[model samples]
Target: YNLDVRGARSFSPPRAGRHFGYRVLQVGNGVIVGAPGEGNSTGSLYQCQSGTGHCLPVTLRGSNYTSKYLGMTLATDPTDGSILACDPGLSRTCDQNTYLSGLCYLFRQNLQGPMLQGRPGFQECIKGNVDLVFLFDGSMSLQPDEFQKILDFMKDVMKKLSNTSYQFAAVQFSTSYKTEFDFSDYVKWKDPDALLKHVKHMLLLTNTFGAINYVATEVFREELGARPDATKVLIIITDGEATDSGNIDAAKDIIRYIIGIGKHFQTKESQETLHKFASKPASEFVKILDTFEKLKDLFTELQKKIDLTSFNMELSSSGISADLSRGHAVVGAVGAKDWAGGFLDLKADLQDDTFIGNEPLTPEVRAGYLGYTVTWLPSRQKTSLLASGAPRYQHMGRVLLFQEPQGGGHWSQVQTIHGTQIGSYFGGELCGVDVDQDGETELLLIGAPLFYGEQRGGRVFIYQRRQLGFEEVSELQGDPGYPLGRFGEAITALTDINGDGLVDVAVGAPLEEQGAVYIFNGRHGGLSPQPSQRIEGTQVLSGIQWFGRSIHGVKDLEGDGLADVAVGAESQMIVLSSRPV
Candidate 1:
């Protein structure tokens, strides 16, 4: 007799929807039982009289095993029920690693026939899905040159999490913010080159407080609110400052909104007040919980005030005084009544007061004079850039190592990596430099052809620390397709892609009629390109004087895990997000 059986989608103990059917040819002295290869089997073997449905476990006499069963070889043991054994070497065995594998093997081997025979029940497992979003800052704080660096970083981060079942979106925020791309467009994240090109085309603008609020209040709230019931997050990459209006209030509102919608909320006032009363004068605030919220708000407001002060101070000192002291005297000031007048106009107009030498000694009048004197004064401090051999160079790259001072002061140079001989030819070449995971700074020099040089090819030099001074670890010559002739290629951006503790360099070449990138795998003392993955596209703007010239790269543009890239040209900017192919 033979029975056919099929496994159920899900199984639990002690329930059988399907059962085996069999027909007996003749009455036998011993009971015989058969189980389907894929079905559960009862532990007991039963036999019933022919034409009767009733079956019962049988206790038999001495068992006889024979190679032939009807016409085939068979081995039977009456006491242990009929036992059939085949080639030992060919038998299936258990694999401890996977439960499914072991279960299937046991079924095939008939080692646990009871489980396969019309079992009562079983259970199945199901998996749930997840979703995500990424947001980026395309504000003017990030110049065009730094945009590509961000794209490279995103490509690397995507590659690492290639198996993640998550979707992403890209947005760039300047004075206004816009979504450039979404995750569904990319077929694969491994294509760093394509991802880089997409980023290069993104448009970025100077950040405004208004723009930040707009993005939070409108775009994020409305456009993305319908996302599935999955984890929602927003990742921001700015210089840690808000360029938009009402930034503090906007941030607070957004955070509160998110928390209100999320699964958590808290507010404490009375407890904090009691704690404050019990603490010492200086420590009272720290002890008070109710005051915490106020303190946080106060801190945020303080930061904005400090930023405004710093902006004004820097404008007064660098833009106004430097030009005036250089003999480019300020002719006059316009729109001086408004506090928001630009530095140049205000400085020029203030000069008129001192010209007549009879103006009231107002603070503005004093500030203008002081700026002029400071500009012309000989430096007495050794740390001042005015000192001799300050290593003046043109087209220098800038990075914010520390936050702007409380009163709007510039940074003190903790370290600087000078370009090589090629720098001299470019009239003060700017190169990309960044610190690696080990805290050691690496410098990348992208120099154009010199006037006297025979070849017009541009050169990229990587420098690392030696015992006493920096030494060139590797040199890269521009591809022939992207020639570097008398006009030099500009290399302006450098950043870490993959977050693997190494910095990759981004070169911007507007003169060469080329907008491309070369990625170098970084190490402590050197860099090399990964196989078949080197250069990437940088979308250049049409009719722009400096296309793909300035770049800024940022991570988590739309609150997604991946990073996005933004490029700035003359008047337009482009932001690129990772998407399907």
Candidate 2:
């Protein structure tokens, strides 16, 4: 979400001149500005109002001397009803018959006194309720002890939201399914303790697939049904992939049914589910058709509520023919057959001694080779790249470039930047990518470190485009910073504030007692420090870092145009909306 705030205005007190020393005094209806000891103040206070769109001077009552007014710092109170002005006293020094002056009276304003009503503080415009359901995997794979751990985790989660209006439900899955409780069952009670007690009695089951499918089909579909007005979310927790092939497929069907039902109920309903399936080795039967990673992704796709109106890439299709023209750019290596045509013989290149693996390619070597296909769209003005070949090391990171045409029908590579890498081995994983102010996009790669060291931590590199090529602009070496990175930290979000056309990077530092967001100001070539603000509210627990693994900023949280920040933490998330001043 991107939030933009406009129509902001501010004012500073008038500065003193050399001819005469001036002091500003706040009176009943106006201001008195006069010379020291001259007794008679001359200037009147100016009043400005947004609706009136004018600044009118008004006379003050019963005021004598106005000393020299130097500078004033103005800030609106959090309540927005009053304005505070911090003014310093000015000391007069006569040097060779010349007087150096200082500041005098501090002025403040109560909007009500001036016939103006103050606007409310930051408000959140996105006010619809969020519904979350936790689907626990109480199967044989998870021991009773581990099941207890999950319950304990939920205990903390419930306690955190004890005061807020939120809805939650618990469903256990095994070979069968059972809903231990619903949102109202707990919401009706004043204390979370009662909910905790109910969760403790939930029995662990052995039917994993049956239980999950049963919930989706019978419990969620038949019992709970779809809420036309509310957001429907299903959070599935599984230690392993669904083993029951029949039920697994049934679960997919059930998810589809739920989406259809939801659509019929209300077009505005947001129907989505989060599947946190454990990363485990794939079974031989499953391996024949898909790898563990692929299977996991399949589950994710099945859980996603598909919109037929939107373009979608089929799971089986490959190459340019597989909806590549529809904004789905492949980022991984494709076989020769998958690319343009017949399979290219790579065995010879692999065996050839001429293939230098250690040295950087010279300009001559880099000139003739076209390694990947990058697609661009005029409507979105966005670019995506597709590459093949799984490197021994992770190379998940890709670079975005915009170049000017140097010759007929072709453009030269002018500016390039790279994204964060995912994992240690680059297997063409698609990471996150965002565009910055300079009209260049930043890519996110999740992969292993290219180099190894204690300070090496988990490596993430941010690059910027230059005339020559993409250069390594900034690198966030995964070293633990003070109060941050004590356990470890990761880049969760990157955005821009102040609308300066630069991207501001937000990092989620979740370690022991250290969960914070470090916002960096991004520029065309690099980064700079320009009044970076930190989000550390009092409601946040000390030493309990926010662990904002995912973050978003949107408007209307406070109904004001200013964007509000929302961050997903360990058990809950927070929304900080902007207000009018």
Candidate 3:
């Protein structure tokens, strides 16, 4: 039977831009369809009768419905009959900072009460607080307007961070440094404007090093209301070179943000001095402006950098995406700390949340969408591995692997798999197959959907699980002669579909002339490189687009011996029945 399920429902009717078939799941006796654009993107879900194809709206109660893109992702746990529905678009507002945190709910198979709910990126607004000290230049080289610009910039910076539990202090430096206001004054004045007005220009000589040492030793002390637990940040705004210099021994823990204004900083010697005053990675910690007027340009950059440095989880987008084993779950946060994407692992409840990369990632990989896709890999020694994809890692794509610490601790990185081509998108899709039915995973399939060669089709790397890690055993491609397609864009394991006591696999090429699904029979060692069956979207039905964009075939819906498959297209879902071996 080839049953068709459309977005048209008797209860709600058709609506424009309702992404009806965005997500499809076969749960209980019905199929759940995700229309993430329904209700002006508040999102809507419908449960369709399996055989007759009649659809009815389904509502998840007991949670504030906001603009949560409900049903954006759906996963079912057959063991406990629990369903996981996620909205990666949900955002949480803390104080004045509004950031994407995403939402996920675990409901019973019957779609009743949400047994568990998670907003993985949610945190107290003022959780990560910082101690800030402004070391401004009031040297004889500066005019009163220039000094006033510095004052305005400082006020705006403090205002931007007003929501956090931040304590501010200001010190003016010339031949001698004067503490204009300490942290105690900021707490007492209760107004940034009142505090800054009290500061008068020194108008003497420049002594930057002395002011840094002074702020580190005196201004940030406990007597001045500086908390020892807060992140110490020193923002130095100067126009002239340091007249005095020495080892900055006391300021080692201080993260210095140095802003150099005026033509003096354009010289090599002044540049080197500015870099010396900055923390590691001068490119991020230092800003040079030709005039004081340009200091406003540094506001947004400084706000983001300071927030990330203070471990603020704003805009993390945790639970934006997820992959799960029977008992283990990995939820992706594409905008994690420093925009270096990470994930939250749930063994039962949420266990640990971790970001990827061993060494600090370059500017490229930091925003490379590291947790774009996640999957779980099980080894023969009762150890399981977590794999996450960074499709834009160095623009070539990368897959990072992690394992739960042997002695019960947080997960740690163990290995990294590099993609070959620049835009191959390797690891964009992943699947773990337990061939031979021995309960041990035999193969890990990685998809490079955007791989380009002669025809610009895609390829899947089939890696056999080794005693240590995994080794590439074979590779799969869809219609080697086809032109321009994302062959391995979606992949799923169909356990022993042919009754050969060997697990099989299904790969989707949603861009190949409408779409196509390729099924490969699993062998003792690995998988058959060539597909045993190719189901073309055009052959299945007319007017269907991207038919293979999503495919699910783990359970046999028709009560047949073989596993049935469900294919999702632009606005429709088609269920194909399986045949006997």
Best candidate, TM-score: 3
Q: Which of the two candidates, 1 or 3, achieves a greater TM-score against the reference?
A: 3
Off by over 4 Å in 1: 1-435, 444-454, 481-494, 499-501, 529-545, 557-561, 578-581
The candidate, 1 or 2, that scores higher on lDDT is 2
Clashes of each: 72, 53, 0
Ranking, lDDT, top scorer first: 3, 2, 1
Clashes of 1: 72
**Which of the two, 1 or 3, has more lDDT?**
3
Looking at model 1, residue 277 earns an lDDT score of 15
Look at candidate 1 and tell me the lDDT of residue 219. Answer: 47
Give TM-scores for every candidate, taking all chains together and pairing residue i with residue i.
Answer: 0.27, 0.29, 0.66
Q: Write the per-residue lDDT of candidate 1 for residues 1-581, one digit (tens) a residue.
A: 00001110111112211111110111132123221111233322234322242334323222221111110111222122323221111111122211110001001122224311110000111112223233454544444544544444445445544565444444566556665554444334435356445443335454535544554455443245324443333333332234333333543422111101001112343232222111111121122212212323333322221112212221221111111222222111111211111112111112111111112333432222221111111112212121000111222211111111124553232323433442333222334354454432344343433322334345555544344434556664444544443223444333454555565554444434534433344556555533212223223333434333433343333333233334333322333332222
2 or 3, which is superior by lDDT? 3
What pairs collide in candidate 3? none
RMSD of each: 34.9, 26.3, 14.7
lDDT of 3 by residue, 401-513 (tens): 87766785867787778998898888888887877777677677889998888774888998876667677778885787565679998888865666667878888898888
